[PDB]
Amino acid sequence: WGYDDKNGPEQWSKLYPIANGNNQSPVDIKTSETKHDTSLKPISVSYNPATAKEIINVGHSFHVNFEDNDNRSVLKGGPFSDSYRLFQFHFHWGSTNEHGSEHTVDGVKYSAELHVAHWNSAKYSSLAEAASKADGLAVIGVLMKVGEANPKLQKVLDALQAIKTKGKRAPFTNFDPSTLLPSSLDFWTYPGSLTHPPLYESVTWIICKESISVSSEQLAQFRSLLSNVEGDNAVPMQHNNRPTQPLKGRTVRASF
Ligand SMILES: NS(=O)(=O)c1cc(-c2nnn[nH]2)c(NCc2cccs2)cc1Cl
Ligand SMILES: [Zn+2]
């Protein structure tokens, strides 16, 4: 699976027919159609930098994975009664600065998007159990607007040189990804899906109102990762953002 013409978002529905389901992600958030929900509590994140484990080139992207054997690193609040356990963060980007976010806001496309992913450790005992459950996953999305270089990305960007080709992996330790979140945690929430196969409709999306910055040159560092395995002809990871999907009657709630 990838973002090419023959393995990309338009091809996913042949093995994953949920791609055409009613709770698919990402979406365009129309702010005139959001419903302010008074019952939404503030997002609370409390992550232990010691849970940072590994950075991996997965061919179409890179993932930073976390130790998830215990509740050292948790998300609570917002729409949730259950505590969610941090397990990964990653980014999405586009071929040029003009697009690359997954979510849009009032049709506006940003240059990239951060995803911070968690699984419901109150109700389930593993990511594998949680992955397919309607209440199983919680992902914070942060829209990334091209502009000033973001110094909080530095450890992540410095690590990429050790995972240049598909399947390379390296230790990635002592990192608290709450340092990447915007200063305001005002958010939108809706019920949706993984944005990559297998596209399970198991994700409660938390989309931050406030963007964070990224430079043109930092985006170029993402696009210079290689989708090929070592020794093959180099094939840059140009883009990995899924198009926005129909809301199909879902309501986006606003904390603000
Ligand atoms: N983009 S996203 O909706 O945040 C997302 C994307 C992926 C992905 N992207 N590439 N490969 N996997 C993912 N992988 C881990 C899994 C969890 C459960 C089953 S597989 C988890 C999340 Cl939440
Ligand atoms: Zn993602």
Q: Atom 4 of ligand 1 has which residue's CA nearest to it?
A: 115
Spatial separation of the C-alpha atoms in residues 142 and 159, rounded to whole Å: 21
Structure tokens that stand for 26 in this block: 């990402």
Tell me if the bond preceding 9 is cis, omega within 30° of 0: no
Cβ neighbour number for residue 135 with a 10 Å cutoff: 18
Residues with CB under 5 A from ligand 2 (ion): 115
Spatial separation of the C-alpha atoms in residues 128 and 147, rounded to whole Å: 38
**C-alpha count within 13 angstroms, C-beta hemisphere, residue 28:** 11
Structure tokens that stand for 148 in this block: 């000033």
Residue 118 Cβ inside 6 Å of ligand 1? The answer reads: no
Domains and CATH numbers, the chain: 1-256 (3.10.200.10)
Identify the nearest ligand to the CA of 193 by its number.
1
Spatial separation of the C-alpha atoms in residues 146 and 57, rounded to whole Å: 24
Residues 6+ away with beta carbon under 8 Å from 36: 253, 254, 256
Spatial separation of the C-alpha atoms in residues 149 and 135, rounded to whole Å: 36
The active-site residue, picked from 60, 103, 118, 239, is 60
What single letter denotes the amino acid at residue 11?
Q
Instruction: Return the closest-CA partner of residue 200 out of 26, 18, 61.
Output: 18
Residues 6+ away with beta carbon under 8 Å from 60: 1, 2, 3, 196, 227, 237, 240
Instruction: Return the closest-CA partner of residue 78 out of 211, 204, 209.
Output: 204
Q: C-alpha dihedral over 85, 91, 92, 93, to 10 degrees?
A: 170
Structure tokens that stand for 9 in this block: 């978002």
What single letter denotes the amino acid at residue 104?
T
Instruction: Return the closest-CA partner of residue 235 out of 244, 224, 245, 246.
Output: 224
- Expt. technique: X-ray
Are 188 and 254 a contacting pair, CB within 8 Å? yes
Structure tokens that stand for 70 in this block: 């215990």
Strands 28-29, 104-105: pairing kind: parallel
Residue entry with tokens 């968690």? 118
Are 159 and 170 a contacting pair, CB within 8 Å? yes
Tell me, in angstroms, the distance from the centre of ligand 1 to residue 218's CA: 23
How would you write the chain as a 3-class SS string? CCCCCCCCCCCHHHCCHHHHCCCCCCCEECCCCCEECCCCCCEEEECCHHHEEEEEECCCCEEEEECCCCCCCEEEECCCCCCEEEEEEEEEECCCCCCCCCCEECCECCCEEEEEEEEECCCCCCHHHHCCCCCCEEEEEEEEEECCCCHHHHHHHHHHHHCCCCCCEEECCCCCHHHHCCCCCCEEEEEECCCCCCCCCCEEEEEECCCEEECHHHHHHHHCCECCCCCCCCCECCCCCCCCCCCCCCCCEECC
Q: State whether the Cα torsion 152-155-158-160 is positive or negative.
A: negative
Are 144 and 31 a contacting pair, CB within 8 Å? no
Spatial separation of the C-alpha atoms in residues 61 and 244, rounded to whole Å: 19
